[PDB]
């Protein structure tokens with residue numbers, strides 16, 4: 456059932472739902488036993504309630520999220536480059552990760568990983 | 581020993597060595613028991629001689645390779661977006677993958693994976 460069209464649309468749904476603070480929209484993309492590792496290197500969060508809590512915490516500030524290149528999607532995986540921008544105490548920050556999703560054959564995301572380091576966090580003083 | 585500076589420089593060495601057709605330059609970046617999976621979804625090539633044969637075959641046409649965004653590097657992994665351009669029988673093709681490297685603590689690449697689908701291969705008739 457899964458295709459590169461479908462996985463690319465899921466990435467686009469995900470970006471829009473982070474913009475909308477549509478915490479439900481995001482969680483419905485995931486399989487019930489999916490993991491989230493964000494950032495790469497940190498402890499994976501596992502299962503629906505943990506994935507929702509991760510995103511709810513991610514969304515306490517309004518996020519402006521945009522894809523900055525075409526999605527790459529093949530087999531049952533997709534990767535994408537994008538930015539997440541926010542303002543706090545009058546400092547604007549732009550974070551530029553590359554994320555990877557793996558899908559199951561039902562078209563749900565079974566794992567996300569978000570790869571970004573300190574040189575990918577762009578902010579003035 | 582490994583750092584995000586080092587992994588970012590390794591990505592830059594890799595891109596330059598594909599441009600130069602410096603097949604040796606590329607192979608020296610890899611650990612002796614490293615794997616290459618390009619594209620994602622295909623059979624991994626394993627060990628020095630298999631990795632060299634993969635790249636030697638990749639390099640029969642001159643490649644023009646360029647990073648198109650900053651490298652993302654954290655922990656012991658890096659991912660990067662870039663293009664590989666070539667001409668054959670007067671058709672120019674631009675392929676736009678996202679690649680991922682994992683490193684060992686010696687700073688060598690233990691696995692590459694290259695993620696690109698048919699919608700990431702840009703070519704006229």
Ligand SMILES: C[C@]12CCC(=O)C=C1CC[C@@H]1[C@@H]2CC[C@]2(C)C(=O)CC[C@@H]12
Pocket residue numbers: 473493513539541550552554569571
């Ligand atoms: C979770 C997240 C959005 C969803 C995504 O898919 C990948 C990222 C990584 C960047 C995170 C961001 C959440 C907001 C974060 C935590 C910040 O305030 C600084 C880093 C940025």
Ligand SMILES: C[C@]12CCC(=O)C=C1CC[C@@H]1[C@@H]2CC[C@]2(C)C(=O)CC[C@@H]12
Pocket residue numbers: 598618638664666675677679694696
């Ligand atoms: C192996 C490679 C360069 C090294 C890299 O790191 C990732 C890629 C994927 C795109 C490959 C390219 C090799 C040349 C290829 C096979 C073509 O002629 C069309 C697709 C393109």
